[PDB]
């Protein structure tokens, strides 16, 4: 059970969930660096504030 | 009240309550400090809801050659319907309503050089047809508008109307107003008024029929800008206590006649002075229960309006 | 139309369903 | 197990989602600002 | 006993992002700034 | 123990995917931008 | 358990709750910040009192 | 124990195929591109 | 058994016959053959 978890957040996340927390928090940072280039691409295709 | 539980639930129904109204109350005050003003409607001398200007349409050339006439010629040198009006008249009226309910220059139907040639230029078949458009409007107005009362304001068909700023290309059933009808339907002109439409207590009816009824009167609504409740009320159908409905009678009657003689005269359409293009509630009011081209009382050439 | 007073009215046209969505809640709740 | 707190953060955030998307079309159908202009 | 279970915010999170990134679209497409799927 | 089960994964992905598929070929067909289908 | 919350608050707050409800505040206090930062860039870019 | 049973996996299969096949030709069909059932 | 031979028979059937009607339906609603005319 509470394993991997670190002795902070032990009353909150399972062995699994921890896990799956990782994935996710991963996946999000992916997510931005991503929307952050497509942001900017379109910017630079035309900008939508003048 | 000596537990925590009390204390905390009286804080959060005050905290709640005080956060809907402040949340309702800043959205209203950016709402109304950021949106602008409703523009009031057209204060034209002439027309009702409808503005002539900016004249851009017409040309530097035009205006110069239409004061050289006025300046060499202080009557008309052929005219055969705007009767009583000098040149300078008859251009004032070329220019607001001709040309202005239409958007159009004067050498779409003139020839500059000299306004009162009748042909020899590729435009004379322009200028018949707007003369045939004249004596219908005055035909149309003198026997139609004419049998309205007084209460409804005397407003006077013109150019303006029925055109509302476009020379050919007019839409008399666009496809924004067939939301729940078939885009195919047509208003019933075939039929004699009043007794084209009544459904109600016959035998010899079913509901076919009162289907399209039904489309009329939501076509008649939808170009009123109205409910049912305009022209009925709604316990009675059959009833006539409310003024519009006898409004209505003629109304139909009158775009009865304007099918009958002028976009199919005797049945074939190549008699008719319009492009096979039969009229609409719509066409006139555009959602309003007063035409926006209407022209207001005294502002349409006598010989044009109902007085005569 | 003032769109003020017509929000505060439909607030309290909204509010009428609480106690419903309440009784769902507790019915919910109470029946593990 | 206390359904207060629960119930105050949901609708908390609802709250703030459904205002921040009512202020946010507000503004745009205004045109005060270019924004999204063609 | 916990205030929250990860499930139940990871499924909201996931409905939220997907409905906000379609209404964006639809908004923006809608719009007319951009070229886009034109003719 | 497990916050999810991999079917349900499996089922929703799948479901969306296809959901996906057919919103953007239908709103390419009606644009009219491409060729594709004409008469 | 009631350990790490406050005796005041322990009538309605466990260790997991005080660990959401501390994560809450700090959204809540980094959200306000930027919120500040957008208005001042948009009063910047076009002020709506005039 | 197993993840997935192969009698849902088979019959899900079988009538999105189907679905699909019809869905493909009725747009077909009615596009009016080919020529096929013609007046 | 995991698989049970009369509901695939009973399906198969049921769906030979839906298609054939339906098929017949669409080629006489088209117009294209010179079946039954008045
Ligand atoms: C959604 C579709 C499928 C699925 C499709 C895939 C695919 C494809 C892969 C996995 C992979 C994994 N999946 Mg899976 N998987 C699903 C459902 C599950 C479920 C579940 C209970 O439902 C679980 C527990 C898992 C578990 C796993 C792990 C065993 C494995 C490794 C995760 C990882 O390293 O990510 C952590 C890393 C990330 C999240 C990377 C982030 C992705 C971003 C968006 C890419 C952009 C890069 C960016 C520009 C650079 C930024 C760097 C980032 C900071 C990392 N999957 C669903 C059903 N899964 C991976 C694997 O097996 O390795 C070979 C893999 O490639
Ligand atoms: C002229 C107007 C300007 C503009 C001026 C401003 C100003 C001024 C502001 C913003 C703000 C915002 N603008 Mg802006 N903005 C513009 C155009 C845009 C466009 C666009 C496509 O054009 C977008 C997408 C945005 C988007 C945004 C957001 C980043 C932000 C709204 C915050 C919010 O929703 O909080 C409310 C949301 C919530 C309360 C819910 C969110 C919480 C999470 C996401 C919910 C799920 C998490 C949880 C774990 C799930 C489980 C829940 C339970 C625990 C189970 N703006 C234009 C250019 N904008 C505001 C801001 O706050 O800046 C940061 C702000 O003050
Ligand atoms: C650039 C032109 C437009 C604009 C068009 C868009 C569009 C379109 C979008 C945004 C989105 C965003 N914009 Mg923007 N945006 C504009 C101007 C703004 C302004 C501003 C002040 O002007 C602000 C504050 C923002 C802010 C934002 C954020 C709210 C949001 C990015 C969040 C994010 O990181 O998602 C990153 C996404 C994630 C973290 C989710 C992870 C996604 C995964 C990794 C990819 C899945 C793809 C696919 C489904 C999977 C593949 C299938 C296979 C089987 C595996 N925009 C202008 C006006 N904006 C996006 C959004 O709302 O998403 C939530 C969005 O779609
Ligand atoms: C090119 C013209 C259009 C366009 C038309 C389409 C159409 C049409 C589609 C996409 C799809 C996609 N487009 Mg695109 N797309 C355009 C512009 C864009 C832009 C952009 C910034 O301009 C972006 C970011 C995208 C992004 C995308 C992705 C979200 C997606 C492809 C990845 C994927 O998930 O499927 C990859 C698929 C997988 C990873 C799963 C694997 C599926 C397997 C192959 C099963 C297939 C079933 C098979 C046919 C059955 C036979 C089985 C046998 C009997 C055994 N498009 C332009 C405007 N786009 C597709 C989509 O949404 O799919 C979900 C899609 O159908
Ligand atoms: C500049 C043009 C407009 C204007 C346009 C807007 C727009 C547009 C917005 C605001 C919003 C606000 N405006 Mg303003 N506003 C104006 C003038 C005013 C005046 C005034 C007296 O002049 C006042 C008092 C305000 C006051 C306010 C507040 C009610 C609010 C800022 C608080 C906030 O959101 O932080 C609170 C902090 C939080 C709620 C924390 C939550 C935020 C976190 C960071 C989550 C963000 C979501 C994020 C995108 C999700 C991404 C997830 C990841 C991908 C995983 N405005 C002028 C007239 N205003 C915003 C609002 O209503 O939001 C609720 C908003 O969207
Ligand atoms: C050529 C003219 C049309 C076109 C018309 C069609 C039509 C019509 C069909 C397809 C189908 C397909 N087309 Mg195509 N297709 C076009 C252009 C495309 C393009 C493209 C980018 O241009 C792509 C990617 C595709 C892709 C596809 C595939 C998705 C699909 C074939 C794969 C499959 O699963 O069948 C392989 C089939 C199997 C693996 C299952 C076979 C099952 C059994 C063997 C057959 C049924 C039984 C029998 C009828 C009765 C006997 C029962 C008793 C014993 C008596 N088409 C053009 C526009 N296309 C088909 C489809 O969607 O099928 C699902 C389909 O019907
Ligand atoms: C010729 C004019 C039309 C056309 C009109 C039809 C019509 C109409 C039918 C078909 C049917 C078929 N057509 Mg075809 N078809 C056309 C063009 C095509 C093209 C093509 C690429 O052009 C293809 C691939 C096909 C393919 C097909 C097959 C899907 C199918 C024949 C195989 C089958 O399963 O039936 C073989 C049939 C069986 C194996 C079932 C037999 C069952 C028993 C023997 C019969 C029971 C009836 C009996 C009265 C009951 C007995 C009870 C007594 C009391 C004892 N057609 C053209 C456009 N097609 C048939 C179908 O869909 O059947 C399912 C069908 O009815
Ligand atoms: C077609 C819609 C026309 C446009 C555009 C303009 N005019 Fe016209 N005009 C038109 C007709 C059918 C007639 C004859 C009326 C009749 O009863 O027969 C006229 C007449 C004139 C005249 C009178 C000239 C004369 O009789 O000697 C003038 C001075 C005149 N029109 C001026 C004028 C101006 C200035 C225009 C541009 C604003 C203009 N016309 C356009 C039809 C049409
Ligand atoms: C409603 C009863 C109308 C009145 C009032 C006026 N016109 Fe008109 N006109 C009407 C229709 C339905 C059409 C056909 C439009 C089409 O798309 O074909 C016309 C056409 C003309 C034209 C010919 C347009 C062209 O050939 O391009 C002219 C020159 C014209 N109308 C002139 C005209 C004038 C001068 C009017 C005021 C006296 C006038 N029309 C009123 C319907 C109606
Ligand atoms: C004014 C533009 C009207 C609107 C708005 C509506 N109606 Fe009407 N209605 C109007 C007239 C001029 C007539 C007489 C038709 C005739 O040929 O004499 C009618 C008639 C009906 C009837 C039948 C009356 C009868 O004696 O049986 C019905 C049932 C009816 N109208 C219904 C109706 C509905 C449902 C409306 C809202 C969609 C509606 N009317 C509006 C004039 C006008
Ligand atoms: C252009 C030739 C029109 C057609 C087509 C239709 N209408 Fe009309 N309508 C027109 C004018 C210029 C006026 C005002 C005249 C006046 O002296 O008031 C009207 C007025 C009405 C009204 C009265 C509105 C009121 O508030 O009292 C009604 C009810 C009305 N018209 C109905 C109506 C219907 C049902 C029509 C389609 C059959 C229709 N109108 C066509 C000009 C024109
Ligand atoms: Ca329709």
Same mark, same amino acid.
């Given at each position: 059970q509470n394993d991997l978890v670190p002795d902070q957040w032990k009353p909150l996340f399972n062995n699994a969930e921890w896990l799956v927390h990782d994935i996710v928090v991963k996946t999000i940072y992916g997510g931005l660096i991503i929307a952050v280039i497509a942001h900017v691409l379109c910017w630079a295709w035309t900008p939508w504030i003048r | 009240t000596n537990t925590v539980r009390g204390r905390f639930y009286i804080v959060a129904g005050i905290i709640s309550v005080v956060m809907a109204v402040a949340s309702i109350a800043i959205f209203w005050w950016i709402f109304y400090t950021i949106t602008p003003a409703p523009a009031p409607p057209l204060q034209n001398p002439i027309y009702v809801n409808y503005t002539q200007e900016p004249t851009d349409y017409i040309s530097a050339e035009s205006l110069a050659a239409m004061n050289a006439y006025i300046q060499a010629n202080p009557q008309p040198q052929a005219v055969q319907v705007l009767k009583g009006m000098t040149t300078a008249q008859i251009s004032a009226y070329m220019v607001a309503q001709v040309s202005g309910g239409l958007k159009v220059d004067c050498s779409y139907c003139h020839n500059i050089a000299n306004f009162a040639q009748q042909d020899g230029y590729p435009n004379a078949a322009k200028k018949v047809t707007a003369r045939k458009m004249?004596?219908?409007?005055? @035909?149309?107005?003198? !026997?139609? $508008?004419?049998?309205?009362?007084?209460?409804?304001? =005397?407003?006077?068909? #013109?150019? *303006? #109307?029925?055109? !509302?700023?476009?020379?050919?290309?007019?839409?008399?059933?666009?496809? &924004?107003?067939?939301? #729940?009808?078939?885009? @195919?339907?047509?208003?019933?002109?075939?039929?004699?008024?009043?007794?084209?439409?009544?459904? $109600?207590?016959?035998? @010899?009816?079913?509901?076919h029929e009162?289907?399209?009824?039904?489309? /009329?009167?939501?076509?008649? !609504?939808?170009?009123? =800008?109205?409910?049912? #409740?305009? %022209?009925?009320? /709604?316990?009675?159908?059959?009833?006539?206590?409310? *003024?519009?409905?006898?409004?209505?009678?003629?109304?139909?009657?009158? $775009?009865?006649?304007?099918? &009958? $003689?002028?976009? /199919?005269?005797? =049945?074939?359409? *190549? @008699? =008719?002075?319009?492009?096979?293009?039969?009229?609409? %509630?719509?066409?006139?009011?555009?959602? *309003?229960?007063?035409?926006?081209?209407?022209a207001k009382p005294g502002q349409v050439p006598a010989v044009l309006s109902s007085t005569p | 139309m003032n769109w003020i007073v017509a929000t505060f009215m439909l607030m309290f046209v909204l509010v009428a369903f609480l106690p419903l969505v309440v009784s769902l809640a507790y019915t919910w709740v109470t029946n593990p | 197990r206390p359904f207060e707190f629960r119930t105050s953060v949901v609708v908390s955030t609802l709250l703030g989602l459904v205002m921040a998307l009512l202020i946010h079309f507000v503004v745009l159908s205004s045109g005060a600002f270019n924004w999204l202009r063609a």
């Open positions: - | 004249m004596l219908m409007s005055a @035909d149309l107005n003198q !026997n139609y $508008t004419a049998k309205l009362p007084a209460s409804v304001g =005397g407003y006077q068909i #013109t150019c *303006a #109307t029925c055109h !509302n700023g476009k020379a050919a290309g007019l839409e008399p059933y666009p496809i &924004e107003i067939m939301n #729940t009808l078939p885009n @195919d339907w047509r208003l019933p002109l075939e039929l004699d008024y009043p007794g084209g439409l009544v459904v $109600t207590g016959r035998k @010899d009816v079913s509901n009162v289907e399209q009824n039904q489309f /009329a009167m939501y076509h008649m !609504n939808v170009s009123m =800008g109205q409910g049912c #409740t305009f %022209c009925h009320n /709604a316990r009675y159908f059959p009833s006539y206590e409310i *003024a519009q409905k006898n409004h209505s009678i003629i109304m139909l009657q009158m $775009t009865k006649h304007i099918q &009958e $003689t002028y976009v /199919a005269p005797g =049945g074939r359409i *190549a @008699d =008719g002075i319009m492009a096979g293009k039969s009229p609409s %509630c719509w066409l006139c009011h555009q959602g *309003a229960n007063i035409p926006p081209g209407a | - | -």
